Amino acid sequence: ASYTVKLITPDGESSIECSDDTYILDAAEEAGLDLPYSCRAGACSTCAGKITAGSVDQSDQSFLDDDQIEAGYVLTCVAYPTSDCTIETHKEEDLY
């Protein structure tokens, strides 16, 4: 886990690059620092984030980023290791 790549949410600048399975809650800050404590696997929608995927992710294994492969989209809790992460939680789709 290195946590450094481009990440930003209501908590503006955020650095994440787990390079070791999208960290659970950490990459979650990417998901939208919503701390998805509902399902953790794939049943709720607390893992938002405009594509928090990152990299290495597309086998329904790891639990964070990767709606299916480089697209956190909605099923972020379905990722693999993750050479790096990236979430457009930044902007808030409203201003910042």
CSV table of N, CA, C and O in Angstrom, one decimal:
chain,number,residue,atom,x,y,z
A,1,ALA,N,0.9,-1.2,0.0
A,1,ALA,CA,0.0,0.0,0.0
A,1,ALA,C,0.9,1.2,0.0
A,1,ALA,O,1.7,1.4,0.9
A,2,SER,N,0.7,2.1,-1.0
A,2,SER,CA,1.6,3.3,-1.0
A,2,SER,C,0.7,4.6,-1.0
A,2,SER,O,1.1,5.6,-0.6
A,3,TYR,N,-0.6,4.4,-1.3
A,3,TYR,CA,-1.5,5.6,-1.2
A,3,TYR,C,-0.8,6.9,-1.7
A,3,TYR,O,-0.3,7.7,-0.9
A,4,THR,N,-0.9,7.3,-2.9
A,4,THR,CA,-0.2,8.5,-3.4
A,4,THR,C,-0.9,9.1,-4.7
A,4,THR,O,-1.0,10.2,-4.9
A,5,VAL,N,-1.3,8.2,-5.6
A,5,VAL,CA,-1.8,8.7,-7.0
A,5,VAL,C,-2.8,9.9,-6.8
A,5,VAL,O,-3.2,10.3,-5.7
A,6,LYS,N,-3.3,10.4,-8.0
A,6,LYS,CA,-4.2,11.5,-8.0
A,6,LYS,C,-5.6,11.1,-7.4
A,6,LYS,O,-6.3,10.3,-7.9
A,7,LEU,N,-5.9,11.8,-6.3
A,7,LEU,CA,-7.2,11.5,-5.6
A,7,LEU,C,-7.8,12.7,-5.1
A,7,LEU,O,-7.1,13.5,-4.5
A,8,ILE,N,-9.1,13.0,-5.2
A,8,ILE,CA,-9.6,14.2,-4.6
A,8,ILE,C,-11.1,14.1,-4.4
A,8,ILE,O,-11.8,13.6,-5.2
A,9,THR,N,-11.5,14.5,-3.2
A,9,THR,CA,-12.9,14.5,-2.8
A,9,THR,C,-13.2,15.7,-2.0
A,9,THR,O,-12.4,16.6,-2.0
A,10,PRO,N,-14.4,15.7,-1.3
A,10,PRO,CA,-14.7,16.9,-0.5
A,10,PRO,C,-13.4,17.2,0.3
A,10,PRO,O,-13.1,18.3,0.6
A,11,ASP,N,-12.5,16.2,0.5
A,11,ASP,CA,-11.2,16.4,1.1
A,11,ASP,C,-10.3,16.6,0.0
A,11,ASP,O,-9.4,15.8,-0.3
A,12,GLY,N,-10.5,17.7,-0.7
A,12,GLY,CA,-9.6,18.1,-1.9
A,12,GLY,C,-8.5,17.1,-2.2
A,12,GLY,O,-8.7,16.0,-2.5
A,13,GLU,N,-7.3,17.6,-2.2
A,13,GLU,CA,-6.1,16.7,-2.5
A,13,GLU,C,-6.1,15.4,-1.7
A,13,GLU,O,-6.1,15.4,-0.5
A,14,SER,N,-6.0,14.3,-2.4
A,14,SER,CA,-5.9,13.0,-1.8
A,14,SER,C,-4.9,12.2,-2.6
A,14,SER,O,-5.0,12.1,-3.8
A,15,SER,N,-4.0,11.5,-2.0
A,15,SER,CA,-2.9,10.7,-2.7
A,15,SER,C,-3.1,9.2,-2.4
A,15,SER,O,-3.2,8.8,-1.3
A,16,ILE,N,-3.3,8.4,-3.5
A,16,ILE,CA,-3.5,7.0,-3.3
A,16,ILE,C,-2.9,6.1,-4.4
A,16,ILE,O,-3.1,6.4,-5.6
A,17,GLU,N,-2.2,5.0,-4.1
A,17,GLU,CA,-1.6,4.2,-5.2
A,17,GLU,C,-1.4,2.8,-4.5
A,17,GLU,O,-0.3,2.2,-4.7
A,18,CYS,N,-2.3,2.4,-3.7
A,18,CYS,CA,-2.2,1.1,-3.0
A,18,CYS,C,-1.1,0.2,-3.6
A,18,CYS,O,-0.3,-0.4,-3.0
A,19,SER,N,-1.2,0.0,-4.9
A,19,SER,CA,-0.2,-0.9,-5.6
A,19,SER,C,-0.2,-2.2,-4.8
A,19,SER,O,0.7,-2.9,-4.7
A,20,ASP,N,-1.4,-2.5,-4.1
A,20,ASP,CA,-1.5,-3.6,-3.2
A,20,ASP,C,-2.9,-3.8,-2.9
A,20,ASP,O,-3.3,-3.9,-1.8
A,21,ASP,N,-3.8,-4.0,-3.9
A,21,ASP,CA,-5.2,-4.2,-3.6
A,21,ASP,C,-5.8,-2.8,-3.2
A,21,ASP,O,-5.4,-2.3,-2.2
A,22,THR,N,-6.7,-2.3,-4.0
A,22,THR,CA,-7.3,-1.0,-3.6
A,22,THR,C,-7.6,-1.0,-2.1
A,22,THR,O,-8.5,-1.7,-1.7
A,23,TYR,N,-6.8,-0.3,-1.3
A,23,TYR,CA,-7.1,-0.3,0.2
A,23,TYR,C,-8.6,-0.2,0.4
A,23,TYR,O,-9.3,0.4,-0.3
A,24,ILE,N,-9.0,-0.9,1.4
A,24,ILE,CA,-10.5,-0.9,1.7
A,24,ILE,C,-11.0,0.5,1.9
A,24,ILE,O,-11.5,1.1,1.0
A,25,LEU,N,-11.0,1.0,3.1
A,25,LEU,CA,-11.6,2.4,3.4
A,25,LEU,C,-10.7,3.5,2.7
A,25,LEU,O,-11.2,4.4,2.2
A,26,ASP,N,-9.4,3.3,2.7
A,26,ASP,CA,-8.6,4.4,2.0
A,26,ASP,C,-9.1,4.7,0.6
A,26,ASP,O,-9.6,5.7,0.3
A,27,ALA,N,-8.9,3.7,-0.3
A,27,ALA,CA,-9.4,3.9,-1.6
A,27,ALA,C,-10.9,4.3,-1.5
A,27,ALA,O,-11.5,4.9,-2.4
A,28,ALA,N,-11.5,4.0,-0.4
A,28,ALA,CA,-12.9,4.4,-0.2
A,28,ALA,C,-13.0,5.9,-0.2
A,28,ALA,O,-13.9,6.5,-0.8
A,29,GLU,N,-12.1,6.6,0.5
A,29,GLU,CA,-12.1,8.1,0.5
A,29,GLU,C,-12.3,8.5,-1.0
A,29,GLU,O,-12.8,9.5,-1.3
A,30,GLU,N,-11.8,7.6,-1.8
A,30,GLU,CA,-11.9,7.9,-3.3
A,30,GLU,C,-13.3,7.7,-3.6
A,30,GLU,O,-14.0,8.5,-4.2
A,31,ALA,N,-13.8,6.6,-3.2
A,31,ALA,CA,-15.2,6.2,-3.4
A,31,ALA,C,-16.1,7.4,-3.0
A,31,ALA,O,-17.2,7.6,-3.4
A,32,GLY,N,-15.6,8.3,-2.1
A,32,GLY,CA,-16.4,9.4,-1.7
A,32,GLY,C,-16.3,9.5,-0.1
A,32,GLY,O,-17.3,9.9,0.5
A,33,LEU,N,-15.2,9.1,0.4
A,33,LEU,CA,-15.0,9.1,1.9
A,33,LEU,C,-16.3,8.8,2.6
A,33,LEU,O,-16.6,9.3,3.7
A,34,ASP,N,-17.1,8.0,2.0
A,34,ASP,CA,-18.5,7.7,2.5
A,34,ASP,C,-18.3,6.5,3.5
A,34,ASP,O,-19.2,6.1,4.2
A,35,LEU,N,-17.1,5.9,3.5
A,35,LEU,CA,-16.9,4.7,4.4
A,35,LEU,C,-18.0,3.8,4.3
A,35,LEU,O,-18.8,3.6,5.2
A,36,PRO,N,-18.1,3.1,3.1
A,36,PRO,CA,-19.1,2.1,2.8
A,36,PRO,C,-19.1,1.0,3.9
A,36,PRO,O,-18.5,-0.1,3.7
A,37,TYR,N,-19.7,1.2,5.0
A,37,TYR,CA,-19.8,0.1,6.0
A,37,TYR,C,-21.1,-0.6,5.9
A,37,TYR,O,-21.5,-1.3,6.8
A,38,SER,N,-21.7,-0.5,4.8
A,38,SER,CA,-23.0,-1.2,4.6
A,38,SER,C,-22.8,-2.7,4.2
A,38,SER,O,-23.0,-3.6,4.9
A,39,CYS,N,-22.3,-2.9,3.0
A,39,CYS,CA,-22.0,-4.3,2.5
A,39,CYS,C,-20.5,-4.6,2.5
A,39,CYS,O,-20.1,-5.6,2.9
A,40,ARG,N,-19.7,-3.7,1.9
A,40,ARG,CA,-18.3,-3.9,1.8
A,40,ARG,C,-17.9,-4.8,0.6
A,40,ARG,O,-16.8,-4.8,0.1
A,41,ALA,N,-18.9,-5.5,0.1
A,41,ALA,CA,-18.6,-6.4,-1.0
A,41,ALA,C,-19.3,-5.9,-2.3
A,41,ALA,O,-18.6,-5.4,-3.2
A,42,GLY,N,-20.6,-5.9,-2.3
A,42,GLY,CA,-21.3,-5.4,-3.5
A,42,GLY,C,-22.8,-5.5,-3.3
A,42,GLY,O,-23.5,-6.4,-3.8
A,43,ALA,N,-23.4,-4.5,-2.6
A,43,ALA,CA,-24.9,-4.5,-2.3
A,43,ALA,C,-25.4,-3.1,-2.1
A,43,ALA,O,-26.6,-2.9,-2.2
A,44,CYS,N,-24.6,-2.2,-1.6
A,44,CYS,CA,-25.0,-0.8,-1.4
A,44,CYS,C,-24.4,0.1,-2.4
A,44,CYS,O,-23.9,-0.3,-3.4
A,45,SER,N,-24.5,1.4,-2.2
A,45,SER,CA,-24.0,2.4,-3.1
A,45,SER,C,-23.2,3.5,-2.4
A,45,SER,O,-23.2,4.6,-2.7
A,46,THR,N,-22.5,3.1,-1.3
A,46,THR,CA,-21.7,4.1,-0.6
A,46,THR,C,-20.3,4.2,-1.2
A,46,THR,O,-19.5,5.0,-0.8
A,47,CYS,N,-20.0,3.4,-2.2
A,47,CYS,CA,-18.7,3.6,-2.9
A,47,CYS,C,-18.8,4.4,-4.2
A,47,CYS,O,-18.6,3.9,-5.3
A,48,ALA,N,-19.1,5.6,-4.1
A,48,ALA,CA,-19.3,6.5,-5.3
A,48,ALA,C,-17.9,6.9,-5.8
A,48,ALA,O,-17.0,6.1,-5.9
A,49,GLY,N,-17.7,8.1,-6.3
A,49,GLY,CA,-16.4,8.5,-6.8
A,49,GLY,C,-16.4,8.4,-8.3
A,49,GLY,O,-16.8,7.4,-8.9
A,50,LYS,N,-16.1,9.5,-9.0
A,50,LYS,CA,-16.1,9.4,-10.5
A,50,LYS,C,-14.9,8.5,-11.0
A,50,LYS,O,-13.9,9.0,-11.4
A,51,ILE,N,-15.2,7.2,-11.1
A,51,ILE,CA,-14.1,6.3,-11.5
A,51,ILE,C,-12.9,6.2,-10.6
A,51,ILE,O,-11.8,6.6,-10.9
A,52,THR,N,-13.1,5.6,-9.4
A,52,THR,CA,-12.0,5.5,-8.4
A,52,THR,C,-11.2,4.2,-8.7
A,52,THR,O,-10.3,3.9,-8.1
A,53,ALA,N,-11.6,3.6,-9.8
A,53,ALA,CA,-10.9,2.3,-10.2
A,53,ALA,C,-9.4,2.3,-9.9
A,53,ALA,O,-9.0,1.6,-9.0
A,54,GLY,N,-8.7,3.0,-10.6
A,54,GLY,CA,-7.2,3.0,-10.4
A,54,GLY,C,-6.5,2.2,-11.5
A,54,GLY,O,-6.3,2.6,-12.6
A,55,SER,N,-6.2,0.9,-11.1
A,55,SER,CA,-5.6,0.0,-12.1
A,55,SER,C,-5.7,-1.4,-11.5
A,55,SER,O,-6.1,-1.6,-10.5
A,56,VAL,N,-5.2,-2.4,-12.3
A,56,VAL,CA,-5.2,-3.8,-11.8
A,56,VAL,C,-6.5,-4.0,-11.0
A,56,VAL,O,-6.6,-3.9,-9.8
A,57,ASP,N,-7.6,-4.4,-11.7
A,57,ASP,CA,-8.9,-4.6,-11.1
A,57,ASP,C,-9.9,-5.0,-12.1
A,57,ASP,O,-10.3,-4.2,-13.0
A,58,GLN,N,-10.5,-6.2,-12.0
A,58,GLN,CA,-11.5,-6.6,-12.9
A,58,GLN,C,-11.7,-8.1,-12.7
A,58,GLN,O,-11.9,-8.9,-13.7
A,59,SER,N,-11.7,-8.6,-11.5
A,59,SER,CA,-11.9,-10.0,-11.2
A,59,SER,C,-12.8,-10.2,-10.0
A,59,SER,O,-12.8,-11.2,-9.3
A,60,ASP,N,-13.6,-9.3,-9.7
A,60,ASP,CA,-14.5,-9.4,-8.5
A,60,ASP,C,-13.7,-10.0,-7.3
A,60,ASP,O,-14.1,-10.9,-6.6
A,61,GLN,N,-12.6,-9.4,-7.0
A,61,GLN,CA,-11.7,-9.9,-5.9
A,61,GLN,C,-11.6,-8.8,-4.8
A,61,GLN,O,-12.4,-8.7,-3.9
A,62,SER,N,-10.5,-8.0,-4.9
A,62,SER,CA,-10.3,-6.9,-4.0
A,62,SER,C,-11.6,-6.2,-3.7
A,62,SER,O,-12.6,-6.4,-4.4
A,63,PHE,N,-11.7,-5.3,-2.8
A,63,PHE,CA,-13.0,-4.6,-2.5
A,63,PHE,C,-12.8,-3.1,-2.5
A,63,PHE,O,-12.8,-2.5,-1.4
A,64,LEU,N,-12.6,-2.5,-3.6
A,64,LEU,CA,-12.5,-1.0,-3.6
A,64,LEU,C,-12.1,-0.6,-5.1
A,64,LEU,O,-11.1,-1.0,-5.6
A,65,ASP,N,-12.8,0.3,-5.6
A,65,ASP,CA,-12.5,0.8,-7.0
A,65,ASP,C,-12.7,-0.3,-8.0
A,65,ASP,O,-12.5,-1.5,-7.7
A,66,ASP,N,-13.0,0.0,-9.3
A,66,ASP,CA,-13.1,-1.1,-10.3
A,66,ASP,C,-14.6,-1.5,-10.5
A,66,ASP,O,-14.9,-2.7,-10.1
A,67,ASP,N,-15.4,-0.7,-11.0
A,67,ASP,CA,-16.8,-1.2,-11.2
A,67,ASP,C,-16.7,-2.4,-12.1
A,67,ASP,O,-17.7,-3.2,-12.2
A,68,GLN,N,-15.6,-2.6,-12.8
A,68,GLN,CA,-15.4,-3.8,-13.7
A,68,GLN,C,-14.0,-3.7,-14.4
A,68,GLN,O,-13.6,-4.7,-14.8
A,69,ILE,N,-13.4,-2.6,-14.4
A,69,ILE,CA,-12.0,-2.5,-15.0
A,69,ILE,C,-11.6,-1.0,-15.3
A,69,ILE,O,-12.0,-0.5,-16.4
A,70,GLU,N,-11.0,-0.4,-14.4
A,70,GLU,CA,-10.6,1.0,-14.7
A,70,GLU,C,-11.8,1.9,-14.8
A,70,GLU,O,-11.9,2.8,-15.7
A,71,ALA,N,-12.7,1.8,-13.9
A,71,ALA,CA,-13.9,2.6,-14.0
A,71,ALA,C,-14.7,2.4,-12.7
A,71,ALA,O,-15.7,1.7,-12.6
A,72,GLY,N,-14.3,3.1,-11.6
A,72,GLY,CA,-14.9,2.9,-10.3
A,72,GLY,C,-16.5,3.0,-10.5
A,72,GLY,O,-17.2,2.4,-9.8
A,73,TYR,N,-16.9,3.7,-11.5
A,73,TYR,CA,-18.3,3.9,-11.8
A,73,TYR,C,-19.2,3.7,-10.6
A,73,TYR,O,-19.6,4.6,-9.9
A,74,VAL,N,-19.6,2.5,-10.3
A,74,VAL,CA,-20.4,2.3,-9.1
A,74,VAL,C,-20.0,1.0,-8.3
A,74,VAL,O,-19.9,1.1,-7.1
A,75,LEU,N,-19.6,0.0,-8.9
A,75,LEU,CA,-19.2,-1.2,-8.2
A,75,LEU,C,-17.7,-1.1,-7.9
A,75,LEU,O,-16.9,-1.9,-8.4
A,76,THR,N,-17.3,-0.1,-7.2
A,76,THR,CA,-15.8,0.0,-6.9
A,76,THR,C,-15.3,-1.1,-6.0
A,76,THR,O,-14.2,-1.5,-6.1
A,77,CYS,N,-16.1,-1.7,-5.2
A,77,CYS,CA,-15.7,-2.8,-4.3
A,77,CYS,C,-15.3,-4.1,-5.1
A,77,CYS,O,-15.3,-5.2,-4.6
A,78,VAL,N,-15.1,-4.0,-6.4
A,78,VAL,CA,-14.8,-5.2,-7.2
A,78,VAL,C,-13.5,-5.0,-8.0
A,78,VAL,O,-13.4,-4.9,-9.2
A,79,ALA,N,-12.4,-4.8,-7.2
A,79,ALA,CA,-11.1,-4.5,-7.9
A,79,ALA,C,-10.1,-5.6,-7.6
A,79,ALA,O,-10.3,-6.6,-6.9
A,80,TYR,N,-8.9,-5.5,-8.1
A,80,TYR,CA,-7.8,-6.5,-7.9
A,80,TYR,C,-6.7,-5.7,-7.1
A,80,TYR,O,-7.0,-4.7,-6.5
A,81,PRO,N,-5.4,-6.1,-7.2
A,81,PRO,CA,-4.4,-5.3,-6.5
A,81,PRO,C,-4.6,-3.8,-6.8
A,81,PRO,O,-5.4,-3.2,-6.1
A,82,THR,N,-4.0,-3.2,-7.8
A,82,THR,CA,-4.2,-1.8,-8.1
A,82,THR,C,-2.8,-1.1,-8.2
A,82,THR,O,-2.4,-0.4,-7.2
A,83,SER,N,-2.1,-1.1,-9.3
A,83,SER,CA,-0.8,-0.4,-9.3
A,83,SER,C,-1.0,1.1,-8.9
A,83,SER,O,-0.1,1.8,-8.6
A,84,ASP,N,-2.2,1.6,-9.0
A,84,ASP,CA,-2.5,3.0,-8.6
A,84,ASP,C,-4.0,3.3,-8.5
A,84,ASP,O,-4.8,2.5,-9.0
A,85,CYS,N,-4.4,4.4,-8.0
A,85,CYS,CA,-5.8,4.7,-8.0
A,85,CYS,C,-6.1,6.1,-8.6
A,85,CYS,O,-5.2,6.8,-8.9
A,86,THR,N,-7.4,6.4,-8.7
A,86,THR,CA,-7.7,7.7,-9.3
A,86,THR,C,-9.2,8.0,-9.2
A,86,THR,O,-10.0,7.2,-9.7
A,87,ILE,N,-9.6,9.0,-8.4
A,87,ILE,CA,-11.0,9.2,-8.3
A,87,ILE,C,-11.4,10.6,-8.5
A,87,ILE,O,-10.9,11.5,-7.9
A,88,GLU,N,-12.4,10.8,-9.4
A,88,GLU,CA,-12.9,12.1,-9.6
A,88,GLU,C,-13.9,12.5,-8.6
A,88,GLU,O,-15.0,12.9,-8.9
A,89,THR,N,-13.7,12.3,-7.3
A,89,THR,CA,-14.7,12.7,-6.3
A,89,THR,C,-14.5,14.2,-6.2
A,89,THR,O,-15.3,15.0,-5.7
A,90,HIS,N,-13.4,14.7,-6.8
A,90,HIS,CA,-13.0,16.1,-6.9
A,90,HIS,C,-14.1,16.9,-7.7
A,90,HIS,O,-14.8,16.3,-8.5
A,91,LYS,N,-14.3,18.1,-7.4
A,91,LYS,CA,-15.3,19.0,-8.1
A,91,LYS,C,-16.7,18.8,-7.5
A,91,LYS,O,-17.5,19.7,-7.4
A,92,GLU,N,-17.0,17.6,-7.0
A,92,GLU,CA,-18.3,17.3,-6.4
A,92,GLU,C,-19.4,17.5,-7.4
A,92,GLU,O,-20.6,17.6,-7.1
A,93,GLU,N,-19.0,17.6,-8.7
A,93,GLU,CA,-20.1,17.8,-9.7
A,93,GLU,C,-20.9,19.0,-9.4
A,93,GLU,O,-22.0,19.1,-9.8
A,94,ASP,N,-20.3,19.9,-8.7
A,94,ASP,CA,-21.1,21.2,-8.3
A,94,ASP,C,-20.2,22.4,-8.3
A,94,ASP,O,-20.5,23.4,-8.9
A,95,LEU,N,-19.0,22.2,-7.7
A,95,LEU,CA,-18.1,23.4,-7.7
A,95,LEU,C,-16.7,22.9,-7.3
A,95,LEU,O,-15.8,22.9,-8.1
A,96,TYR,N,-16.5,22.4,-6.1
A,96,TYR,CA,-15.2,21.9,-5.7
A,96,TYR,C,-15.3,20.7,-4.8
A,96,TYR,O,-15.4,20.9,-3.6
